[PDB]
Structure 1
Amino acid sequence: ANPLYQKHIISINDLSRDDLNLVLATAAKLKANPQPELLKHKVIASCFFEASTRTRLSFETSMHRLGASVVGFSDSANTSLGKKGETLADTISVISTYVDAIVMRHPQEGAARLATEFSGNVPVLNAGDGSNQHPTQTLLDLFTIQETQGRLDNLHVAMVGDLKYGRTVHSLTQALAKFDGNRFYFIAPDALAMPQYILDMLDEKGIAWSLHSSIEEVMAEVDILYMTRVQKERLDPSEYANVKAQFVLRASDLHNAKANMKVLHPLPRVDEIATDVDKTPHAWYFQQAGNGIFARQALLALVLNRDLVL
């Protein structure tokens, strides 16, 4: 039976290097020969207690591409749950009484791991829990670095944007720190800097990093430039505007990019990457989102299948 069989994918900190490679090699195989009936007769719950369309449509398409049925809800705007004080332990004790895996997003951190204490043997896969984890976004980003760069080690990865509160850059720095010789360049407004617990883990593992203030200082050496959105309310209107709105990428800036460099953005991008970047070979944000299908498919294939045929 494969290692991931019937596991809960709750946190990146819980997956080993080995675990991460396995998911990535299965994604590569399913992207190459489809397996449209692998999860035939499985029913999977898509519980989005917090609405997230991008993530939901992606997760359910990939459940659909392996042959599974989907039942579920998207809420934030009412869909009767927690109705009349019903706890989340209780909702999950009732949903696991009839679906074969629960995919869930929830506003509070810790909610997917609590689901785990009540779901019996139905695997729980986390699609986001407040400001804590989002594994399936890190799996798709990793898959995309690997497929475009050929490797996951010895990379020069720049992380540009709001690094203090960008929940995805924090997990991608932890995943990449599992591999060797990567070098990190953080480029953030002072108010939005990469927190200490990250930096402290990088130092302790002997991994190199450095802060720069503009992308021009580092463009030439860079393989993956991962942009994040600054949310305008983490700053006031005039802080955003005043001199910090210059963590914006444009085509002109890409001149000296290595031929292999790729630009990644978990999306919505709104300001930070100008529309003229789209026409360049380095724009890989949309192809990154399409890889969400294979990464996500691979996790559901590995978790529901004892043995995998390939």
Structure 2
Amino acid sequence: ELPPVASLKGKSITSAEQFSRADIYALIHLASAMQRKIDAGEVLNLLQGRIMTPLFFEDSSRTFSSFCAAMIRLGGSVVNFKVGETLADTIRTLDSYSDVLVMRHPRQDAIEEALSVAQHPILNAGNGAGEHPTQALLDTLTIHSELGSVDGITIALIGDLKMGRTVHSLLKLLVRNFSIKCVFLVAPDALQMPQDVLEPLQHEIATKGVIIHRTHALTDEVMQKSDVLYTTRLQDITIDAARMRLAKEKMIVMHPLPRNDELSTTVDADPRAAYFRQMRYGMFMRMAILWSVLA
């Protein structure tokens, strides 16, 4: 079966904060059941005659495609709305004809604006520097499916943690819902994990017990102890073939993409390079989210 996760039915998907551990577990397992079927040649007509509409004020072919492909693989349909008309006027236009909106916008508070006037679910595909929860959830699914489990892991977050909307959402989702041992906040000092992200996290950091061992650049303590390396762009941070020596045998590298120098192509064929497999997990997590919300 592919029963939907009941608690998302009709819900908007704005923040990682809204997802309980039972929620995550269920989506992780719906996504896998789905992968099992798609990989087996099965066709899913779960969402026929239902329409998703992207509302991408900023371009991103990968995020766009992944949502589309996911909707299509559930039998659903896609109608692009290329984007001065006010945001609300657009939101009401999409509500005319679609069942679910998917919005990517450069201002953080554009999301809260839209939800005030929206009659159908809005899925947040990302907003300025705040969040990007379907990424956080797809990243967790990657880890669950690559390493066996997410409980007890050590995780490194490389790159500018200030602007990177993937690292915030992930940091919240993981700490709040799992038993994370350590978290290497690796970046330049100026471009680090903001105070407002780290502050609401402080209850769980204590009672679970969670080492936030920061670092200016990629130390060997990181490479040695990390089960997951989650690097990002910024446009002694590079992960290359040389440095990968120091990694354990059961670990993975991740990157949401796109990339620059900070992750060498010299790592691509390494079986612990999970950054490409991560995108396919993405399609499957979004199929699980789309079915759950629109069921």
TM-score normalised to the size of structure 2?
0.90
2:262 aligned counterpart, secondary structure? coil
Structure 2: stretches of 5+ with no match in the other structure? none
Q: Deviations over 1:110-132 (max 9, x none)?
A: 22332222222x11111112112
Does residue 47 of the first structure (1) align with residue 65 of the second (2)?
no
Q: Which residue of 2 aligns with 1:210?
A: 213
In 2, the alpha carbon distance for the partners of 1:140 and 1:56 equals: 15
1:204 shift after superposition? 3.1
2:139 aligned counterpart, secondary structure? helix
In 1, the alpha carbon distance for the partners of 2:201 and 2:112 equals: 26
1:165 shift after superposition? 1.9
Q: Which residue of 2 aligns with 1:242?
A: none
1:23 shift after superposition? 1.5
Count residues in correspondence: 281
203-212 vs 97-106, greater mean Cα deviation? 203-212
Q: How does 1:3-82 map to 2 (within 5 A)?
A: 3-34=7-38, 36-75=44-83, 82=84
Q: Which residue of 1 aligns with 2:173?
A: 175
Q: Deviations over 1:118-158 (max 9, x none)?
A: 222x1111111211211111111111011111112211001
**Contact 1:202/1:208 (8 A) holds in 2:** no
Query: Which AA in structure 1 matches 2:185?
Result: F
Choose the corresponding residue for 2:281, options 283, 291, 297.
Answer: 291
1:99 shift after superposition? 1.0
**Contact 2:174/2:180 (8 A) holds in 1:** no
1:202 shift after superposition? 4.3
In 1, the alpha carbon distance for the partners of 2:116 and 2:197 equals: 28
Q: CA RMSD in A?
A: 1.6
In 1, the alpha carbon distance for the partners of 2:223 and 2:59 equals: 36
Choose the corresponding residue for 1:227, options 221, 227, 231.
Answer: 231
Q: Which residue of 1 aligns with 2:251?
A: 261
Structure 1: stretches of 5+ with no match in the other structure? 76-81, 232-245, 306-310
Asked which structure has the greater CA Rg, the reply is: 1
In 2, the alpha carbon distance for the partners of 1:11 and 1:74 equals: 25
Indicate how the Cα distance of structure 1 residues 283 and 74 shifts in structure 2: closer, same or farther if over 3 A, else same: farther
14-23 vs 123-132, greater mean Cα deviation? 14-23
In 1, the alpha carbon distance for the partners of 2:172 and 2:163 equals: 15
Query: Which AA in structure 1 matches 2:213?
Result: S
In 1, the alpha carbon distance for the partners of 2:198 and 2:25 equals: 24
Q: Which residue of 2 aligns with 1:113?
A: 112
In 1, the alpha carbon distance for the partners of 2:12 and 2:190 equals: 35
**Contact 1:176/1:182 (8 A) holds in 2:** no
1:175 shift after superposition? 0.6
**Contact 2:127/2:165 (8 A) holds in 1:** no
Q: Deviations over 1:209-249 (max 9, x none)?
A: 20233231221211000111111xxxxxxxxxxxxxx2011
**Contact 1:159/1:187 (8 A) holds in 2:** yes
**Contact 1:214/1:247 (8 A) holds in 2:** yes
In 2, the alpha carbon distance for the partners of 1:94 and 1:260 equals: 49
Q: Which residue of 2 aligns with 1:279?
A: 269
In 2, the alpha carbon distance for the partners of 1:188 and 1:134 equals: 20
In 1, the alpha carbon distance for the partners of 2:116 and 2:56 equals: 19
Q: Which residue of 2 aligns with 1:303?
A: 293
1:24 aligned counterpart, secondary structure? helix
Indicate how the Cα distance of structure 1 residues 210 and 202 shifts in structure 2: closer, same or farther if over 3 A, else same: farther
1:49 shift after superposition? 1.9
1:147 aligned counterpart, secondary structure? helix
**Contact 2:154/2:226 (8 A) holds in 1:** yes
Query: Which AA in structure 1 matches 2:173?
Result: A
Q: Percent identity?
A: 43
Q: Which residue of 2 aligns with 1:243?
A: none
1:191 shift after superposition? 2.0
Q: Deviations over 1:53-85 (max 9, x none)?
A: 11101111111111111101344xxxxxx3xxx
In 2, the alpha carbon distance for the partners of 1:28 and 1:169 equals: 23
TM-score normalised to the size of structure 1?
0.86
Q: Which residue of 1 aligns with 2:124?
A: 126
In 2, the alpha carbon distance for the partners of 1:199 and 1:129 equals: 19
In 2, the alpha carbon distance for the partners of 1:198 and 1:116 equals: 22
Query: Which AA in structure 2 matches 1:135?
Result: P
